[PDB]
């Protein structure tokens, strides 16, 4: 019993933060408030208040986002002033999720302008916050309106995009786990969703690459990353994006105290639980080498040990879901594979 | 660009607790966490959990609600374990409110079982809960089910049935500003919502009844008051049910320590504005004045000055609004109705 | 999986006819066509042309209703000119019904005028028209708008209001088949959609009135009617306001060649059923007595052994439902009724 | 004001009629209808009929589709016995809009069981019928579900997949239509309706391919035609796949006693578009060249005369619309285009 809401605007290209005004004039917002990660004003700020003031949209308020931690969220919240129409989140994934949260708490439109993509954050109805000290993804709501500039993009560091390439590439073995999980009378999946989810992460996956800083390449990462957000709106869950390979990485994040992109840690996830499946090892053993995502990862120092534990307590984290980690035998093969596998023995310590 | 979440459960009437296995078993739910106000469990908690458990239902915890803090609340949602399907909300106003807004945060089912009805906190929307030490009305998510058992209400004490009636009447006076505001592109009105309040309002304005404990008095009360909370759900917004004089009883809650319950304040508001309107008057001083409560409420020794004020900041509740006291006019007019109505004079 | 379209516009009461311009407005319609019943021109033709005119809304065609033949509606309604934006239908039931089905085959608008209440036609998503010479029940669409002048159903033949009478109390019977169906096995019940049909009937079955020509006895007439029409939009079938009571008039128009009015078919069922539920008797009895509507169906000469045979075929309209009249033994009941029954001996032949 | 139904079902690969009943189990039918095509029942009959019941699932009754004639249609959907659960529609494109329109009537479930891919018909909320004498494009309901065996399409004459890349590749026009449509406020374009739509075409018109036959290159075409009606009901109106090219072909199909299979004559029409647009021009003559398009069309005689005229009445269609040919100029251009164009010399008379 559960309602969908795709986005009214979706802009991924070029010259889009120029265009910010008539871009989201379709919202017929009369006053926003604008959120800016550090930094972020001094290179885009200027442009963007310009554009929006001469579409005849008043802002009320610019402010900086300096955390996720969920009390100064709250905080910040309830500070917002009751005119304000719509929130303007611009800025990297962290940014985003607590202006999104924001938005989430006051049942405000919310308007996406990532300047990075780390992961799906900026096109999803999750959050990721700070709780208690621990990184936790929490329910909030799908962006309004999702504005990517690839200029932006191109400009961001290398980080950011393998780890958007490591959030991506977890749709395949996520979609392997909801099946698995369906046929175990535990779901049952929302066929579009898998539909959009597979299109997009099957189209970049496909596309030939200079570099990962390729206009085409950047472009192709962030429509799949976008889709991967609508697929679990629609779906009303998180399913079509985030399986096990996600439990994985939630789960390191309760017990490191400084835990690697989210991304990050879900695409080495990702190459394990294909292992663990036996489904599509290929595809994404070629992807994530031949765009230099094992490469940067061997510098990370990420430990064999941590990885085996995250696996062990993956189930955990959604104990009611019925992943291949939900399974004694699977977890064990998992560990087995961290300890053996010759891409993992050279990428983690 | 709004969705509408009618509630899948609707049960108002006898032998509804000793039953909610059964009724809550069409959500499919099947692991839910109870949560009982103070000295709730003492009352209803054996049965409640053996229907859910016989009803193969498992129960992952029973727990006590203590406050309507927000900070509390949020603490506390996010000790709800993950394997949770299901919140169950059994009490009054304040404890199904923290409930309500607990599965709000972690975007689970919620199951509204209300064993009084001091306002319309158990049908709608939206989480009255404390902000800052202040009594705030928050956005949380309209119950998935909602249980009345008129036994219960009618063993609750009277001073949530007057606040009960407060909350209700009070749909008369917000229907017109909402109309108002129409008139003065402010808003636009949504007249399937407008329809089923107006018809819950004018069911029970016209109920006959010998007293406000009234089996059928009360199954009146509470099906309007529930049909409240589904008319806000349908507009996307509180207007069907919150005009003035709920500005006026939000803004109170801003300055006094130590406020009336909520549909006290929104009905004396009503009254107030019913004056200022010019419009239902009669039928709004009938009702009030029949029912004991105004009678009731001039116990409570409520300050004229209080709700001058009120009356001034009413607008600054909701600025973006267009409500009669958003016109400083009629702002005069409300503060000289309290200084002359004879009615006002004697309960404040 | 089934999606609901509560209408936009909703207007009971008085003054709406010449009003109709700014009622409709909110359906920001730019070109319009009027289908008129036979009559009704003459009575408010130029009044609501002048309205619509004066909104700023384009009439391409004003037309006459003249029939509810299957055939001739789908040839009419191909002939609508691809620029119309909505089609409003002001008549009576036929009239209404007709249009309404035009406007489901063309995907428009469709705003609802009655000009009589015989039945809840003009609100709900079902439409009676002719098929191979037999009345019967079709699926359409609810309509988007329904404005419903009381001044002009004040006016209206005394034999349209006792319709209305009839086809409002059917819900007190048609709910209860609707609960026998469901503790069968047979369906699920909507909650929200039960609450309001009850809420618009009980409010009706307790107006106090002097006569039914009364605004107050008419407005809730025509409230309540609406609301069964919203009903039905709300569950997604006719059960809401649809139970034996109506498969009983259904198998009468198969067999008769000249049926009465749905609305007076469907009270004398509604009274029967009553006493076969043994549920709600006495205030069935009593509202049927007061309004006359027991007085006014004697003078019909409608035949016990028409009603014999309908509710012996009753279950065939709907074989699949599972009311009281799916069930032998409750048939021979209701035929026992038909046959003993006091009212029934004066009111049949 | 306007409700989305995406498809339950979506059923796109190898192995699918055989398993048509645990497919289609999802939407708890109990009891279905099967219409076949003419010659269909012989090749598939027998084994989605075992599946069927093997699901546990009844079987009312087994059916010849024998045309698309609006009359027969209407006759035959009322024919259909009202225990019915849901119609299951195999066979081409005039069976399967055939059995969607009746379940439109019925307002039952449909299930699309293409064994051809000439058109989106199967996937989208429109059927092309037969309405007095002329085929034309009306108002239906989108499937409930869509089960499509690539194996079955493998062995279709190659007429329908040749109809079926002209149906597809119009959405690049159709899309350029609707931006213009846009700038000139006659309408509002739906972000996600456009992504999908784009995203389907873009990931068909780049599959490498040896062969029309080739089974990657049908499961493209399949993916994107089943999306290109997603996107129609997604948006509420046929724009995402229906601009001015589409308006050519519905144009012909009022004066021409005998035309061409629609995505034929859609695909002639897209790259007429195409050069008027000057937009997407070697995409569009690339792929219908690469897929001998262009070749079979040359073999069928269609008239530049015919064009011609069908140009100049395109905006007859849907006067209330603005495509590139509302606008005079643009009708002259087109037609300049028919008489210049060296591949439009070649493949029409
Ligand atoms: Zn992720
Ligand atoms: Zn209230
Ligand atoms: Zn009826
Ligand atoms: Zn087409």
Same mark, same amino acid.
């Given at each position: ?49 310009? =554009? ?67 992961? &799906? ?89 200079? =570099? ?10 962030? &429509? ?28 390191? &994040? ?19 639980? =294909? ?75």
């Amino acid at each position: 019993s559960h309602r969908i809401a795709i986005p009214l605007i979706l802009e991924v290209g070029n010259n889009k933060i120029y265009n910010i005004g008539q871009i989201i004039k379709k919202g017929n917002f009369k006053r926003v408030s604008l959120y800016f990660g550090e930094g972020i004003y001094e290179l885009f700020g200027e442009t963007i208040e310009k =554009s929006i003031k001469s579409s005849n949209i008043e802002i009320e308020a610019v402010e900086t986002v300096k955390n996720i931690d969920f009390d100064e969220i709250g905080t910040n919240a309830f500070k917002i002033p009751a005119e304000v129409d719509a929130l303007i989140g611009i800025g990297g994934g962290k940014a985003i999720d607590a202006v999104k949260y924001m938005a989430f708490l006051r049942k405000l439109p919310f308007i996406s302008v990532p300047t990075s993509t780390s992961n &799906d954050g900026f096109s999803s109805p999750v959050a990721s916050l700070l709780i208690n000290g621990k990184r936790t993804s929490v329910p909030a709501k799908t962006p309004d309106g999702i504005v990517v500039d690839i200029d932006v993009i191109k400009g961001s560091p290398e980080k950011f995009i393998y780890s958007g390439i490591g959030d991506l590439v977890s749709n395949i073995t996520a979609l392997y786990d909801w099946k698995f999980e369906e046929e175990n009378h535990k779901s049952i999946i929302d066929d579009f969703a898998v539909m959009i989810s597979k299109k997009s992460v099957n189209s970049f996956v496909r596309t030939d690459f200079k =570099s990962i800083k390729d206009e085409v390449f950047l472009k192709e990462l962030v &429509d799949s990353l976008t889709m991967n957000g609508i697929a679990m709106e629609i779906a009303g869950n998180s399913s079509p994006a985030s399986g096990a390979e996600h439990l994985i990485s939630h789960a390191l &994040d309760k017990f490191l105290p400084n835990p690697q992109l989210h991304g990050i840690q879900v695409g080495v996830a990702t190459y394990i639980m =294909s292992k663990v499946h036996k489904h599509r090892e290929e595809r994404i053993k070629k992807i994530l080498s031949d765009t230099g995502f094992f490469n940067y990862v061997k510098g990370l120092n990420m430990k064999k040990s941590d990885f085996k534990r995250a696996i062990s307590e993956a189930h955990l984290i959604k104990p009611a879901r019925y992943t291949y980690l939900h399974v004694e035998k699977n977890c064990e093969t998992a560990k087995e594979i961290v300890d053996t596998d010759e891409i993992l023995r050279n990428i983690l310590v």
